[PDB]
Amino acid sequence: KHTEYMEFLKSVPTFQSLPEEILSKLADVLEETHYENGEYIIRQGARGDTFFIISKGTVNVTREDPVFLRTLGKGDWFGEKALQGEDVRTANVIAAEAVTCLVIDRDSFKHLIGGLDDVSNKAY
Numbered sequence: 001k002h003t004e005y006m007e008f009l010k011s012v013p014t015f016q017s018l019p020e021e022i023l024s025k026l027a028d029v030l031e032e033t034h035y036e037n038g039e040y041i042i043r044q045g046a047r048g049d050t051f052f053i054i055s056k057g058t059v060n061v062t063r064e065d066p067v068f069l070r071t072l073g074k075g076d077w078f079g080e081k082a083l084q085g086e087d088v089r090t091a092n093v094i095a096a097e098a099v100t101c102l103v104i105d106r107d108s109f110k111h112l113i114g115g116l117d118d119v120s121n122k123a124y
């Protein structure tokens with residue numbers, strides 16, 4: 001799996017700009033997690049410690065009745081806001097089909113991903 005993860009991370013513009021040794025560590029520590037259609041991946045208001053990169057499928061993002069914000073797909077990512085400052089989730093993320101996410105915990109994110117301009121300067 002490590003090699004599959006590497007080839008994938010090297011294909012995503014946000015992450016292909018990272019040194020390959022950092023990508024190798026990410027591939028080492030990430031957890032592959034799977035969801036079915038309609039499954040809540042993140043709930044607004046919860047406290048979070050994980051970052052997600054979509055490696056298969058699509059998700060819907062909604063936010064306080066909730067309003068639809070956008071859909072994200074393979075190579076997109078989400079969950080950074082709870083890792084920036086306060087740890088609260090700011091929106092819901094819901095699987096829109098069979099989804100696989102590569103999940104990175106806070107310990108790894110703060111060292112390997114948090115300084116990336118694409119992520120740190122991400123605006124919606």
Ligand SMILES: Nc1nc2c(ncn2[C@@H]2O[C@@H]3COP(=O)(O)O[C@H]3[C@H]2O)c(=O)[nH]1
Binds near residue numbers: 042069070079083093
């Ligand atoms: N607050 C907000 N989050 C969004 C939006 N579009 C995608 N997201 C993602 O939805 C995620 C919910 O978890 P986080 O708040 O940690 O991080 C959020 C973002 O990564 C948006 O328009 N507003």
